[PDB]
Design a protein around this nucleic acid. Structure first.
Ligand SMILES: [Mg+2]
Ligand SMILES: [Zn+2]
Lengths: 49, 586, 1340
DNA sequence: TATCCGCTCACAATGCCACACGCGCTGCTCGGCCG
DNA sequence: CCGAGCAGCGTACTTGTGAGCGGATA
């Protein structure tokens, strides 16, 4: 009941609550609107770093 | 962990599955396909679609909320994820920490117990045996009867005679916790000493129900046990019924007597002008009770009696003075219940609801609380006894109809007829016609109600060394209404006299009242208008209980964030209290 | 004349108004609805022919292949209703439809089709209702409540108050079809009109109008008027009409024809209008500032350059006026604007429209319809014409068109089921007028706008919902199926037709099992009107305006009957005389009142026709020959009571009961109690439970003779005759010769139902009420069903009741009952619980019902039979094995030799798991019946063989009675045949002819008649044998149970529950309560004669809860007993029949001007004795709901006996033995035991099982579960102290799995100390939050 | 460019109890598979 | 046997309140 496990993801995935919390935290942390973040995450556009 | 998503093998082809496991399987499938795809050097579009599917599965299992797309069988709402399992009315923060199920409890209907004291309540035999199994087990292990726990279980299931005294021992001073289904304030949960009663229902003290607002139309109350020395002593100290007499909102006692006892005491105190034993003399309350039990004198008769009243001085002294009063036999008999603290003028009245309420208030303020509970218990006992011995009963002839009621109705009809004639002639309009008929009908209703009221407080005459002497009406319905037991003035007014004006679907007043009363046959359209007006009033309660519950919820949400911890701060700021004299006088 | 059931015990009635229309069939609503469903209806009307002529035929994608329809027929019921309830199958019938497939070759626009295939196919089965209007789906008998929704058509709502917080009234016109998409024209706080479809985005109506082949010019000339501004030589003249200038002040000099009329600043009044009209003037002198404020209607393109200069919907300016004057356009068409006559709403709506042509309008509207997917003008117009102009997504039925035409002042009443452009034009005109002030808004709380739908309509709707799917399937199948493929059999499919109808009848918010606990409950459950469900308002999102009752519900909807709780006013009961209209409305019978006489003719008025006429009152005092006793009478013109004369009256009420429902009409003295108490009693009288011996109600309402008969609980005589064979289980009726069938007739056999389980676990049983030789009439009652007495509804029991406080045992609502009631077996009922155990087909071997249960005591096995099922009539108290269910767990292929050896020698059966079902703990009772059903192919056990042999023997007894009757008839015939040879007959045919039909002499006629009779005999024998074999094959065939099961075993436990302190009982006037305790007879009060009162109530609850009628009832009850008492004093002491007849006549001839007027001289002086025997226990008195008896009638009835006039008798205390002063009233009251007895409420749990997902105790009584500690209880605890108490109640006793064990161990040895520990659920949330990215960590 | 206003979206609605009944994108086809 | 594509078609609006995102005119 208390012991847990872990899934090793080969691709790191960002949390959903930091995107659709209205407002989002990453949206205010990156100074970027939620639309650009959603279009980048869902594999439609790129963004420089 | 798998325990929080259990998969028990259900009987038959049907299986008890958890939905989170489907999302887990989906995300594991997508993760495995991603791990296998990136090793064969797949091009960009396939691995990108795979990563997109993995991210979609992740953001779906974390929370199942979309714009308008929801996958589910027939509930018209999608499957609950862990986030949805945390939120909602059925979520963790509302279903598994706020309200939880507790064991060692019971639920049964309530029944009136008039013999039990205020500090105790009834409890069924089977419920008592079920709610105290380990106490009986431990007491049997303490004695040389039950060797093992299985032996004690076989004994208590065998239902022999040597287990009943053990129950009486373990329920001698072990208070239980009674609870009403809706708990508006703290009084919805109290503590009571249980007494074994034979049957299958929970016997409750009659007076304490007012604290729960629990009628006896089939209310199902719950019962719990402390099961802890600390909890037992707490229930005996604070949550006990005797320790809670004053309402948390107002300093007025929640121990106000009910309708039966106040009716009995009003009958015992209401005196006529001529009866058996009129104008005689007695030497004390005990001799008066003996004279009443022998039947030589009536219950109520103006008799000069001698009593001894105790008055409290500035210190804790109680000076006794013997005085000859001129009161009725009922008050002198009831004086045996009043302790020495209260004076005699507190009972030299008709003892209405407010009268006995202020009597209990003064008794608690003067003598404290220790004798106040016994005083109230004896009040209820004597009230029930003398109400049973009286024989109060409402009949079809007890409600007198005014003689000139028909004449008043005819006058109002002639007035409305001439008003309608003036309206048809073109002198007055329709709005002024309505405004002039409403007040006419209101005045007629007021006149007929005053006539009925003065006709109810009369007709009770009897020869008292003379020919005719008017006195307080001994009528049953008047004794029930004027005493404030159950009926009010408006209720008896609309019952005996005309009901008056009614409402309309818009909410305003219809220009035609109900010229009939309950004692007479109501026309079908009159009853239709009345039930139309009453259905709204009935539905308000059902549509308001949930709003009041939600309001109480919000109020306790904003509240319960503080406790008193400091004795004094050393400030001087405050508010300037003044009586509210705005509008009217005060 | 009086029926024979009335001659057995005639009920004394009251009232002075004689009824004119008899009480109709109580179940006529659902019966008529179902009869209008399954029947050959021409012209494709309601039922099934609508779905056959509105859907069929079907054509492929121009494939020249059509599927026609000819007719449909209902198959015979595959099972009897009794066998249906037994086996749990659906009481349904097949649907054999003769379809016609016509297919032709390609390249034929209208080529003559060939190879017609007319084939009958079976497409699904339809459930049928019995003669009681109940559908037996799966064992239980469910019903369909008639829903109440909004009638299809238009409505004009007035939104105000909290609408946009603007304080401006808004008018919205909602067009709602019968089946399709909605439409709504709405307004804003501004002057802008908009349109919307199914609560979509707000769009102007100009674009949705232009999409229907319209232009701006047509818009303005259809909506607005025409204003003419001409370009004369000068002054820009303009045509004047004296009616338009009303309300507007003259901004210039109103003068013309060289005669001044109005100055500048003076309004034109009606007298000025007449003065200007008497001159007949049109043209005046108007300045430029007047036209410079108007707006040009149409586009005025130039002719010199060919370019538009002044576009539409543009106010005229200096440049525009100069251009229109210099171009050469003299005629100027402008629109009119006046906020009091025609408010500007088309100009602004046109100028806000972004589109200008029909094409782009469709594109924008489609972009609104579905986001994205822009069509190249292909899907836009098609979707727009399919959502509102196609019969595929718009099924506005005849009632919709009727409401549409009636609302718009249209003279016609019919039309098409499709919308139209001019209809939208008219409804928008009506909205504009209702905004300007012309008209009134249509309220939604009016029965004229609220239409009811019965079971037939929703059944047809679900049939169509399945038929559209079968049509899609058959179209996708025929879309490529060429000529000569197959017969039209596999082209159709059973699913989802059967699936849809089964899910509709079984699983819906309205298809519900009916409460089989009271005949009155049954009558009031079928005559129910619901507003929830499909197309209904939810109970959690409703307003206070729908819960209230409208004055239009007079005689149509009962206002005093509604369930108390969340759904108040939403669930109503139908009136007694109420009927459904053709369109679906509610009509009420009335009497047509002529100028002088009130003709006794019935007219069914509708809700819309209410305000048209005026209705007289029911209890209006009238003289003979139809004349009112007073000129000034009370009536109602238009939903409002008033006073009219004896000439303005046009219609009269039919009876005084048409307002009250059938449920509340059984409450006597209903005109003497408040609406609240009567409403509470109406919901309680429905929840009555029948006792062992039902007692007739003394204070009846006359309706008891109907509810008991109109229901399906009483065996009604279909054909009158003489009762030949009486039996506690069956009744045989010999049909009289007058109504007997002229060929191949016999006798009727009514098989009563014994103690069987009902839907509420209430013992339902039928008992006979006639004996041998007693002649019965057609329609008369034959056997009393549950809660009935001699063809009369007997819900509860009458008892002696007093009204006095008794030591507080009647404190607030509690009742005190004497021990006499529990001693006399009065309020004891029977509860029949059904326990079912199924032998599912599991892996590792199937499950068995063997009896060799291992690891169990022999005393536990002693109750089972040789098969493994307990015997019939065995008592069980605690959890005991009553079925031998075992489940294999280990090795399979158990050899039969070793299998039987295990029961003799060696080891036991290990692979069992002891899965045998037992009764729950606490519940007791005696098993009375067993029910077993097997899967097809599985061999039955011996108990199934026994029960099928029992039912086969019952059928054998019935068929043998029939056979012996017919055989005795045929042998009397053969005696009459060979009677010519009488000597040989009497000598060698007395004893042996019953088996020696073989005879012959004088062949010429004797042989012919003998061979004909032998033919008849052999044919009769063969037919009886065939019927017997069919019955046996029907009762012996296996039944499908479930996928993966062997057999199901059902048992019935019938426990007799008596009255005890804790049960809930109530009268019939809302005086409910709980029984306080049982007192002995010596402790209860008693009169001076020595008769102790059985029940004493609280006389304090009468004044506040104003129900005085019951008191009246009580008094009346006393009077009744008095008569009975006298009858007893006339029966115990042997008295001549003359004195008895005289007394009965004096009783029935009470001076109250009653319409009864019975005569005792017409009786046979023998039935009078039976009647007096039936009256010795009381005199059943009937009183109307509003024509009831006055006080003087009860006074004189009491005077008839030796009872006191006041009704109050001095009572002596049982305990002390003294006299109670203030004489208490005492009488007879009819009371009921509610279905809330204590035996299903009291429950307690010390330690039981815990839930698997959370370590918390269980809940409920069926399982061993404790109560729940609510959050408000936590608040109450926090209000007090009790930190340790709350920690114990919440953590150790509830959640801590390691704490409750330690606490139990500390309690079982005397250690009162707990440990807080850590809550598992707290740790559960701790884990989940830790598992989430938002983790946590405990600190020091 | 600000700022009152309108359009769009998210969140609420049993507070408790008892009893009873019952399942709405999967079906079909083509790349990859360790006790 | 498992995972990805192929396919006909497959997947709350009642009223009230608070918050965010434009949005149109000075
Ligand atoms: Mg209650
Ligand atoms: Zn302070």
């Amino acid at each position: 009941r208390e012991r847990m496990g872990h899934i090793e993801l080969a691709s790191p995935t960002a949390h959903i609550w930091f995107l659709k919390s209205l407002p989002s935290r990453i949206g205010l942390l990156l100074d970027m609107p939620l639309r650009d973040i959603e279009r980048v995450l869902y594999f439609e556009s790129y963004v420089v770093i | 962990p798998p325990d929080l998503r259990p998969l028990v093998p259900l009987d038959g082809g049907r299986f008890a599955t958890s939905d989170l496991n489907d999302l887990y399987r989906r995300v594991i499938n997508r993760n495995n396909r991603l791990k296998r795809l990136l090793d064969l050097a797949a091009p960009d579009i396939i691995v990108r679609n795979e990563k997109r599917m993995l991210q979609e599965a992740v953001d779906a299992l974390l929370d199942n909320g979309r714009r308008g797309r929801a996958i589910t069988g027939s509930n018209k709402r999608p499957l609950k994820s862990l986030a949805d399992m945390i939120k909602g009315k059925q979520g963790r923060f509302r279903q598994n920490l706020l309200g939880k199920r507790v064991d060692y409890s019971g639920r049964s209907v309530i029944t009136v117990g008039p013999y039990l004291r205020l500090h105790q309540c009834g409890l069924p035999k089977k419920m008592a045996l079920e709610l105290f199994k380990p106490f009986i087990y431990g007491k049997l292990e303490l004695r040389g009867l039950a060797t093992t726990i299985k032996a004690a279980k076989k004994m208590v299931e065998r239902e022999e005679a040597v287990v009943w005294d053990i129950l009486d021992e373990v329920i001698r001073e072990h208070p239980v916790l009674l609870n009403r289904a809706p708990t508006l304030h703290r009084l919805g949960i109290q503590a009571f000493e249980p007494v074994l009663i034979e049957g299958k229902a929970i016997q409750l003290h009659p007076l304490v129900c007012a604290a729960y607002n629990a009628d006896f139309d089939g209310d199902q109350m719950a019962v719990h046990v402390p099961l802890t020395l600390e909890a037992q002593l707490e229930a005996r100290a604070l949550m006990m019924s005797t320790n809670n007499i004053l309402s948390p909102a107002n300093g007025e006692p929640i121990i106000v007597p009910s309708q039966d006892v106040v009716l009995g005491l009003y009958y015992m105190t209401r005196d006529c002008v001529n009866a058996k034993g009129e104008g005689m003399v007695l030497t004390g309350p005990k001799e008066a009770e003996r004279l009443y039990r022998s039947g030589l004198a009536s219950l109520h008769a103006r008799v000069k009696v001698r009593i001894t009243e105790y008055e409290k001085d500035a210190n804790g002294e109680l000076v006794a003075k013997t005085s000859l009063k001129d009161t009725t036999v009922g008050r002198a008999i009831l004086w045996m219940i009043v302790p020495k603290g209260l004076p005699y003028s507190i009972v030299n009245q008709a003892l209405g609801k407010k009268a006995i309420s202020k009597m209990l208030n003064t008794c608690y303020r003067i003598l404290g609380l220790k004798p106040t509970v016994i005083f109230a218990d004896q009040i209820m006992y004597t009230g029930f006894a003398y109400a049973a011995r009286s024989g109060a009963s409402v009949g079809i002839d007890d409600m007198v109809i005014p003689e000139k009621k028909h004449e008043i109705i005819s006058e109002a009809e002639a007035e409305v007829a001439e008003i309608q004639e003036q309206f048809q002639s073109g002198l007055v309009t329709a709005g002024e016609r309505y405004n002039k008929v409403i007040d006419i009908w209101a005045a007629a209703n007021d006149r007929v109600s005053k006539a009925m009221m003065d006709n109810l407080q009369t007709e009770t005459v009897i020869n008292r060394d003379g020919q005719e002497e008017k006195q307080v009406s001994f009528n049953s319905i008047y004794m029930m209404a004027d005493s404030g037991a159950r009926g009010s003035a408006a209720q008896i007014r609309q019952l005996a006299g005309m009901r008056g004006l009614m409402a309309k679907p818009d909410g305003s007043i219809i220009e035609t009242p109900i010229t009939a009363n309950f004692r007479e046959g109501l026309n079908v359209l009159q009853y239709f208008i009345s039930t139309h007006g009453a259905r709204k009033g009935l539905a308000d309660t059902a549509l308001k209980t949930a709003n009041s519950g939600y309001l109480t919820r919000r109020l306790v949400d904003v509240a319960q964030d503080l406790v008193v911890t400091e004795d004094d701060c050393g400030t001087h700021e405050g508010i300037m209290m003044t009586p509210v004299i705005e509008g009217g006088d005060v | 004349v009086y029926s024979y059931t009335e001659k057995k015990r005639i009920r004394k009635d009251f009232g002075k108004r004689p009824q004119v229309l008899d009480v109709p069939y109580l179940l006529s609503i659902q019966l008529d609805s179902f009869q209008k469903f399954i029947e050959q209806d021409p012209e494709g009307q309601y039922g099934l022919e609508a779905a056959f002529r509105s859907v069929f035929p079907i054509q492929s994608y121009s494939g020249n292949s059509e599927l026609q329809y000819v007719s449909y027929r209902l198959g015979e019921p595959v099972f009897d209703v009794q066998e249906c309830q037994i086996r749990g199958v659906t009481y349904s019938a097949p649907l054999r439809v003769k379809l016609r497939l016509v297919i032709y070759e390609r390249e034929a626009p209208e080529g003559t089709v060939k190879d017609i295939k007319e084939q009958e196919v079976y497409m699904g089965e339809i459930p049928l209702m019995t003669d009681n209007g109940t559908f037996v789906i799966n064992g239980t008998e469910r019903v369909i409540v008639s829903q109440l929704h909004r009638s299809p058509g238009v409505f004009f709502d007035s939104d105000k108050g909290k609408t946009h917080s603007s304080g401006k009234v808004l008018y919205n016109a909602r067009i709602i079809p019968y089946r399709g998409s909605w439409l709504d024209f709405e307004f804003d706080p501004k002057d802008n009109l908009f349109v919307r479809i199914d609560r979509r985005r707000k769009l102007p109506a100009t674009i949705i109008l232009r999409a229907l082949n319209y232009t701006t010019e047509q818009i303005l000339d259809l909506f607005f008027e025409k204003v003419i501004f001409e370009i004369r030589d000068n002054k820009l003249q303009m045509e004047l009409v004296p009616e338009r200038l009303r309300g507007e002040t003259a901004s210039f000099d109103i003068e013309a024809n060289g005669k001044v009329y109005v100055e500048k600043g003076r309004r034109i009044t009606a007298r000025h209008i007449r003065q200007l009209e008497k001159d007949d003037v049109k043209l005046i002198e108007v300045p430029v500032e007047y036209i410079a404020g108007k707006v040009v209607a149409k586009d005025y393109i130039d002719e010199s350059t060919g370019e538009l200069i002044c576009a539409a919907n543009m106010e005229l300016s200096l440049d525009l006026l100069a251009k229109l004057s210099q171009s050469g356009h003299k005629r100027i068409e402008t629109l009119f604007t006046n906020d009091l006559d025609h408010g500007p709403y088309i100009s602004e709506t046109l100028r806000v429209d972004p589109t200008n042509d029909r094409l782009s309008a469709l594109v924008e509207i489609y972009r609104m319809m579905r986001p994205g997917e822009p069509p190249t003008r292909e899907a836009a117009e098609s979707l727009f014409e399919n959502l509102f102009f196609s019969e595929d997504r718009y099924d506005l039925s005849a009632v919709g068109r009727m409401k549409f035409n009636r609302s718009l002042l249209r003279e016609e009443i019919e039309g098409s089921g499709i919308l139209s452009k001019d209809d939208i034009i008219d409804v928008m005109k009506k909205l504009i007028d209702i905004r300007n002030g012309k008209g009134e808004v249509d309220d939604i709380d009016h029965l004229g706008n609220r239409r009811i739908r019965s079971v037939g309509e929703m059944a047809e709707n679900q049939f169509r919902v399945g038929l559209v799917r079968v049509e899609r399937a058959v179209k996708e199948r025929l879309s490529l199926g060429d000529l000569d493929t197959l017969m039209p059999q596999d082209m159709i499919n059973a699913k989802p037709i059967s699936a849809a109808v089964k899910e509709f009848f079984g699983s819906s918010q309205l298809s519900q099992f009916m409460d089989q606990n009271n005949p009155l409950s049954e009558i009031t459950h079928k005559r129910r009107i619901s507003a929830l469900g499909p197309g209904g308002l939810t109970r959690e999102r409703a307003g206070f305006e729908v819960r209230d009752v409208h004055p239009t519900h007079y005689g149509r909807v009962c206002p005093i009957e509604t369930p108390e709780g969340p759904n108040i006013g939403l669930i109503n009961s139908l009136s007694v005389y109420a009927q459904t209209n053709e369109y679906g409305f509610l009509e009420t019978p009335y009497r047509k009142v002529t100028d002088g006489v009130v003709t006794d003719e019935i007219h069914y008025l509708s809700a819309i026709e209410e305000g048209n006429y005026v209705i007289a009152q029911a209890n209006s005092n009238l003289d003979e020959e139809g004349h009112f006793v007073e000129d000034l009478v009370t009536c109602r013109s238009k939903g409002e009571s008033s006073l009219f004369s004896r000439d303005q009256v046009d219609y009269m009420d039919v009876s005084t009961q048409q307002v009250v429902s059938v449920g509340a009409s059984l409450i006597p003295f209903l005109e003497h109690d408040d609406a609240n108490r009567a409403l509470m009693g109406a919901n309680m009288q429905r929840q009555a439970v029948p006792t062992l011996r039902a007692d007739k109600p003394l204070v009846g309402t006359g309706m008891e003779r109907a509810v008991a008969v109109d229901s399906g609980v009483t065996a009604v005589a279909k054909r009158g005759g003489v009762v030949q064979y009486v039996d506690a289980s069956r009744i045989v009726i010999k049909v009289n010769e007058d109504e007997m069938y002229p060929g191949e007739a016999g006798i009727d056999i009514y098989n009563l139902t014994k103690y069987t389980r009902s839907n509420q676990n209430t013992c339902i049983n039928q008992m006979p009420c006639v004996s041998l030789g007693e002649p019965v009439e057609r329609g008369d009652v034959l056997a009393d069903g549950p809660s009935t007495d001699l063809g009369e509804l007997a819900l509860g029991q009458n008892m002696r009741v007093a009204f006095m406080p008794w030591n507080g045992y009647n404190f607030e609502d509690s009742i005190l009952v004497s021990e006499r009631v529990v001693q006399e077996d009065r309020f004891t009922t029977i509860h029949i619980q059904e326990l079912a155990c199924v032998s599912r087909d599991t892996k590792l071997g199937p499950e068995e019902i063997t009896a060799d249960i291992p690891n169990v005591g022999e005393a536990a096995l002693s109750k089972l039979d040789e098969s493994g099922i307990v015997y019939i009539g065995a008592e069980v108290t605690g959890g005991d094995i009553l079925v031998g269910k075992v489940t294999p767990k280990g090795e399979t292929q158990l050899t039969p030799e070793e299998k039987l050896l295990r029961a003799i020698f060696g080891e036991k059966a290990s692979d069992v798991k002891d899965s045998s079902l037992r009764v729950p703990n606490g519940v007791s009772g005696t098993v009375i019946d067993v029910q077993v059903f097997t899967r097809d192919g599985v061999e039955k056990d011996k108990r199934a063989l026994e029960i099928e042999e029992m039912q086969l023997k019952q059928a054998k007894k019935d068929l043998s009675e029939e056979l012996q009757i017919l055989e005795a008839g045929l042998f009397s015939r053969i005696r009459a045949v060979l009677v010519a040879g009488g000597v040989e007959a009497e000598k060698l045919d007395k004893l042996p002819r019953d088996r020696w039909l073989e005879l012959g002499l004088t062949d010429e006629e004797k042989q012919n008649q003998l061979e004909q009779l032998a033919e008849q005999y052999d044919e009769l024998k063969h037919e009886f044998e065939k019927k017997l074999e069919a019955k046996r094959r029907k009762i012996t065939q296996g039944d499908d149970l479930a996928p993966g099961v062997l057999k199901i075993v059902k048992v019935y436990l019938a426990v007799k529950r008596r009255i005890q302190p804790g049960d809930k009982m109530a009268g019939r006037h809302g005086n409910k309560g709980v029984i306080s305790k049982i007192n002995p007879i010596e402790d209860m009060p008693y009169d001076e004669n020595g008769t102790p009162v059985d029940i004493v109530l609280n006389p304090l609850g009468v004044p506040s809860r104003m129900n005085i009628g019951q008191i009246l009832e009580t008094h009346l009850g006393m009077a009744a007993k008095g008569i009975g008492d006298k009858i007893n004093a006339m029966l115990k002491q042997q008295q001549e029949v003359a004195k008895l007849r005289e007394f009965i006549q004096r009783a029935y001839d009470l001076g109250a001007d009653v319409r009864q007027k019975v005569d005792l001289s017409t009786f046979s002086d023998e039935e009078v004795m039976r009647l007096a025997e039936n009256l010795r226990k009381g005199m059943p008195i009937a009183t109307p709901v509003f024509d009831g008896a006055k006080e003087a009638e009860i006074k004189e009835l009491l005077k008839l006996g030796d009872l006191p006039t006041s009704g109050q008798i001095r009572l002596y205390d049982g305990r002390t033995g003294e006299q109670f002063e203030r004489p208490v009233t005492v009488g007879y009251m009819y009371m009921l035991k509610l279905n809330h007895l204590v035996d299903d409420k009291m429950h307690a749990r010390s330690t039981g099982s815990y839930s698997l997902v959370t370590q918390q105790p269980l809940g409920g009584k069926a399982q061993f579960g404790g109560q729940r500690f609510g959050e408000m209880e936590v608040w109450a605890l926090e209000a007090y102290g009790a930190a340790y108490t709350l920690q114990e109640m919440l953590t150790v006793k509830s959640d801590d799995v390691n704490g409750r064990t330690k606490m139990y161990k500390n309690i079982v040895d005397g250690n009162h100390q707990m440990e807080p520990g850590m809550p598992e659920s707290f740790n559960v949330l701790l884990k989940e939050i830790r598992s989430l990215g938002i983790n946590i960590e405990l600190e020091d």
